[PDB]
Enzyme design. Structure first.
Site, PDB file in Angstrom:
ATOM      1  CB  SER A 154      -0.964   0.167   0.983  1.00 53.51           C
ATOM      2  OG  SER A 154      -1.500   1.075   0.801  1.00 53.51           O
ATOM      3  CB  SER A 260       3.885  -3.589 -14.964  1.00 57.04           C
ATOM      4  OG  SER A 260       2.835  -3.380 -15.761  1.00 57.04           O
TER       5      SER A 260
END
Length: 335
Positions: A154, A260
Site C-alpha cells: 500500500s 509495470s
C-alpha cells in the site's frame, strides 16, 4: 560508502534518534542467519494502518522479520508520523499528508495542489533517509551492495515506487505491492482519483507520468529488478472522512499497470508483474512461500546483471507472474 552520522552506534533490534535532515528517525535491524560474507538486504515498509512491528512480526501482515532466517539482513524503517514508535498503527499516520505530501504514512508522493510542486524535483526525506540508514547499518553488518532491495504494501508500496525512481543507482531492485503511481497528465497536471483511473483505462500500455515520482519521470534509470504485485479485483482502498464514513480513493489496477509499463520499458530493468487475489493487504496466500520466492527472485538478479539472462521460476500457488508489463488487467487493443 558505508558510514554513520558521527557518533551513531547502530545495533541489532530497535535503533532510535538516527539524525537525518533535521529529523530523528528509527529503524529495526534483524541480521541475516546462515550467511558467510555480505548478506543481501531487505527493507520492508508497512502501509497506512499496520505498525512496523506488525509488518515485521504478524503473520497476516507479512512477518517480514522472518526473512533474516532466510538469509537476509532486514532493516525496517519506522514511519515519520509514528514518532519513532514501531507499534503505532493508524494513529496520526493514516490520513492525507502535509507540507506538499499527498499521504502521511511515508513521503511517497506530491500532493495534488501547488504545494507539492517542489517534490516534482526532490526525492523527499524518506527516500534519502533509507539510503543513509542502509549505509549506516553496513558499517556494522556485512551488506551485499549489489543486493539492497526495499519493498512494501500500500503506502509502503507507493514509497517503494518513489524510492526506485529517485535512487535507481543505489537500490538493486524492489517489491512494490499495491503501491500507487498517482497518475497525472503528460504535462504533470494532477488528476482526480476518477480521471487518473480513466486515463490508464484509455491507454493501458502507455507510459504514464505520476505524482509518485520525478516530474517528468526519468528517461533512464539505473539497473534494477522490480516486482510489482496486484491483489486482484478487490485490491482497492476506501479512505475514511473525518465523520468516519468511507469512499473509494485508490484503485491499484491502474497504478500497478502504470508502474509495470514504466519499468518494463526500461532497458536495464527486469520487471516482473505478479497477480494474486488477496485484495489490498500483504499477500495472504502461502505468505511465507511468497516472501521467500519473491526475495530470492530479486536476489537472483544482483545489480548490474543482464536482463537477458534473468530466468523466472514459478511462484507459489495462488500467484501468476511473468516478466514484462501486466497484460491481464486491461483488454488489449487487438481486442
Amino acid at each position: 560508502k558505508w558510514e554513520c552520522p558521527a557518533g551513531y552506534e547502530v545495533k541489532e533490534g530497535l535503533n532510535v534518534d538516527f539524525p537525518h535532515k533535521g529529523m530523528k528517525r528509527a529503524f529495526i535491524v534483524y541480521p541475516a542467519k546462515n550467511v558467510s560474507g555480505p548478506a543481501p538486504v531487505w527493507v520492508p515498509m508497512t502501509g497506512s494502518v499496520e505498525s512496523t512491528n506488525d509488518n515485521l512480526t504478524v503473520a497476516r501482515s507479512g512477518a517480514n522479520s522472518i526473512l533474516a532466517d532466510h538469509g537476509y539482513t532486514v532493516i525496517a524503517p519506522v514511519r515519520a508520523c509514528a514518532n519513532q514508535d514501531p507499534n503505532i498503527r493508524g494513529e496520526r499516520c493514516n490520513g492525507p499528508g502535509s507540507n506538499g505530501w499527498n499521504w502521511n504514512p511515508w513521503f511517497e508522493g506530491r500532493a495534488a495542489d501547488p504545494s507539492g510542486e517542489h517534490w516534482k524535483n526532490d526525492e523527499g526525506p524518506d527516500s534519502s533517509f533509507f539510503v543513509a540508514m542502509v549505509q549506516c547499518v553496513g558499517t556494522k553488518y556485512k551488506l551485499d551492495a549489489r543486493r539492497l532491495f526495499l519493498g512494501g504494501i500500500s503506502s509502503g508500496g507507493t514509497m517503494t515506487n518513489r524510492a526506485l525512481l529517485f535512487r535507481s543507482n543505489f537500490w538493486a531492485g524492489g517489491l512494490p505491492i499495491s503501491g500507487e503511481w498517482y497518475v497525472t497528465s503528460d504535462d504533470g497536471t494532477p488528476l482526480s482519483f476518477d480521471d487518473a483511473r480513466a486515463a490508464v483505462a484509455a491507454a493501458p500500455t502507455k507510459i504514464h507520468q505520476g505524482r509518485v515520482g520525478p516530474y517528468p519521470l526519468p528517461a533512464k534509470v539505473g539497473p534494477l529488478i522490480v516486482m510489482t504485485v496486484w491483489g486482484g479485483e478487490k485490491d482497492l482502498w476506501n479512505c475514511t472522512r473525518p465523520d468516519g464514513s468511507r469512499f473509494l480513493c485508490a484503485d491499484y489496477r491502474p497504478s500497478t499497470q502504470a508502474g509495470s509499463n514504466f519499468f518494463s520499458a526500461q532497458p536495464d530493468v527486469v520487471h516482473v508483474a505478479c497477480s494474486s487475489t488477496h485484495g489490498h493487504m500483504w499477500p495472504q496466500l502461502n505468505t511465507q512461500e511468497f516472501n521467500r520466492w519473491a526475495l530470492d527472485t530479486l536476489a537472483s538478479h544482483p545489480k548490474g546483471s543482464d536482463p537477458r539472462s534473468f530466468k523466472l521460476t514459478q511462484p507459489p500457488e495462488g500467484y501468476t507472474c511473468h516478466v514484462g508489463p501486466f497484460t491481464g488487467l486491461y483488454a488489449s487493443a487487438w481486442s
